Amino acid sequence: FPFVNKQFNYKDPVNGVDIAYIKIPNMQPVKAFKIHNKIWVIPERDTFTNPEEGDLNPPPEAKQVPVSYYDSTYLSTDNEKDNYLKGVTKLFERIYSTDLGRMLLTSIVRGIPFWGGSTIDTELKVIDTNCINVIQPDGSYRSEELNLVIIGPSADIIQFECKSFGHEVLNLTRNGYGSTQYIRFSPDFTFGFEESLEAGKFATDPAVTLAHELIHAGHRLYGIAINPNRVFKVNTLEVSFEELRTFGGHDAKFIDSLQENEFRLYYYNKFKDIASTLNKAKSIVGTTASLQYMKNVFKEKYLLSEDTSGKFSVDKLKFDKLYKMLTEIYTEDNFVKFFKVLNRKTYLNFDKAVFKINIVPKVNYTIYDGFNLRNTNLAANFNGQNTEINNMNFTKLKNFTGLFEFYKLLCVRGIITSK
Amino acid sequence: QVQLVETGGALVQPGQSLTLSCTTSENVFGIYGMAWLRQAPGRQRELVASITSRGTAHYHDSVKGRFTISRESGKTTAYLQTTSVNPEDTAIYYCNSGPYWGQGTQVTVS
Amino acid sequence: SQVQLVETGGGLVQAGDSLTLSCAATGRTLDYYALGWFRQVPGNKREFVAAINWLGGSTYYADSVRGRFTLSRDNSKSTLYLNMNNLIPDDTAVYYCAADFSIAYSGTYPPAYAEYDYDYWGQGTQVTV
Amino acid sequence: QLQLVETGGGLVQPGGSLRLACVASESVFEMYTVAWYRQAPGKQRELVAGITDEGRTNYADFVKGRFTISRDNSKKTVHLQMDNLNPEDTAVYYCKLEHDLGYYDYWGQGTQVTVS
Ligand SMILES: [Zn+2]
Ligand SMILES: [Zn+2]
């Protein structure tokens, strides 16, 4: 019955299938694990996606963001990597335990990046940035396409992100194509927030943060992520449209209804254009599979309607439902509702405290209850998330900054010239 | 659909003291906080009062001292009290909580 | 969880006739799994025959066997059958039967076509025509 | 995933009425078309009545307006008012959640309905 079909240990021998050394489009291979189709986990500190961030030593204290935490020794031992892999897998299972998280994970699995990398109009070809090189026992390399990579954080440990390799001219995260998403995330740390009671000494369920990054990845796999240039400026530091949409709840209403309808119109037209490119496709390059096979795969991804002549079109109501699922249903607020946990009430609650956790032992954190274990002292009043009642599960590493205690007035920033 | 309604706007003599009230339907004050912003026809939008969901308050330098903003924890209505009002407070006062706005009360001095 | 796969039916036949290979499965569920068949001639790379998704009967055949080979299932005994019709001398190879798990296999979703997607394998049976 | 349990079944005299109900509390009720299916001991599991998230109802031919399917999205429940029951309706009724995008389907354990 579980999401992950295998029980993985970091020291298990590689086989070139689901446990193997790999290489990213941009090093020497790193040991990674294929926990599910199209999803891989690299129990390593991310020094590969950005070589400019291949230094784990903390920058000068003036250059440090107020909400940051550094530890160059984290995720360096085989035991640390084993525990990281097990915790990431457990959080994936906890997300899968809910219907919302299962739906999101299904969307991610079937959200294969589009084969729009050919210079010929009628040819379907894969984009190499959406692949990884898997070492074979033979010793050769296999170019395998995928959807999601979960890698440990870089220098800043609590800097969780979802970023993708880009096309030189195309914006794959915004033209409906999609690209393989790499998520900097760690299950060994959690955040504490301060929400007024209607005394806020509660910690974040890391499943909620992983689901946040998974919603980012789901937006970006279907190529509907909001441009990171569309940003609110806060005054009394900025907040992107993407983050506010991703949190959902009341924060999503910072985006005007007219902008939401413009997004819907543009992505309806882009899905129509993708369906038409599938209709006009005649050749396919670089795969055992047939052209109709890739056609059907992307039909199942974008939920295109197929007439009795094989040609594709987008059912308007099915597009509306898919888009509303990806943007309004996949939200942090809905994940808080499903997990029945306590969490920040707005993405604008910038102040965080940094705590160390160990979610792998089932006496500490379970798939169905998180920290609020059944039939325990932790089951009531979210006591499992109380960093003082459940003190055996949280160890304070960084205190609250105290620098974000003011009303957040958001003002849209205008279009700016760029290079 | 959330909505903020503010009341208490009328004529005020410079000696008199005013109280503006703002209420909401879903209690978003405990999520974001609340802000009072006043706009004079000649000037631009001015942030007169702000307060977070925890209670910390911040004021503009024009109204610092003579103004006080209250939210009072679990309550779903916020108040802005003013003493020794002067001509600078002739403006339309709008209520804000995150993305939601009121539609203003007019305050005019003699 | 884990599912075992056994393959029976290989043998010697003559060009043009039909044959059926059986893949028996002993696992907990077989739900949300995709069962595929692959060829391998001693020498070249192992190629793909054809696969289904079990839960929602989504089939897919490789262009070397489209229209000739047909997939069929039997839930009475949890078995898979590959019916190879109009066999030709180029079909002589070792046939393997494999399984892959994905939560998206329910319904009309197409199964995987690459060996690496499939994680569980059998020992295979030889077919010579 | 989540357990779907149907309530309101039992035995009734021929020509009576019954209320069936399934609750899908933890499912995302929207994005599903909830429906009722009917399974006779040796026969097939045939579609009975399905209602979309919007409200558009769908009934089978053997249901001649005597069954009414209701859907409350507030409480994420689905009811089926069966009137004028006949011995042809004797079967176990299952409540199904059909994903509107075809991702996956949920099936309940069913409740038995017998008339005599
Ligand atoms: Zn991009
Ligand atoms: Zn985010």
Residue numbers in the entry:
A (entry chain A): 1 to 26, 30 to 201, 210 to 247, 256 to 438
B (entry chain G): 1 to 110
C (entry chain B): 0 to 128
D (entry chain C): 1 to 116
Publication text:
We show that the VHHs that inhibit the LC activity occupy the extended substrate-recognition exosites or the cleavage pocket of LC/A or LC/B and thus block substrate binding.
In the JPU-B9-bound fLC/A, the C-terminal peptide forms a loop and a short β-strand which is similar to the conformation of LC/A observed in the context of holotoxin. Therefore, the C-terminus of LC/A appears to adopt at least two distinct conformations, referred to as the β-form stabilized by JPU-B9 and the α-form captured by JPU-C10. JPU-A11 and JPU-D12 bind overlapping epitopes at the anchoring site I of LC/A, and both are potent LC/A inhibitors. JPU-A11 binds LC/A mainly through its CDR3 loop involving fewer electrostatic interactions (10 H-bonds and 1 salt bridge) in comparison to JPU-D12. When binding to LC/A, Y108 of JPU-A11 occupies a surface hydrophobic patch on LC/A which should inhibit the binding of I171 of SNAP25 to this area. Structural studies revealed that three protease-inhibitory VHHs, ALc-H7, JPU-G11 and ALc-B8, bind to the α-exosite of LC/A. ALc-H7 and JPU-G11 have identical CDR3 sequences and thus not surprisingly recognize LC/A in an almost identical manner, so only ALc-H7 will be discussed further.
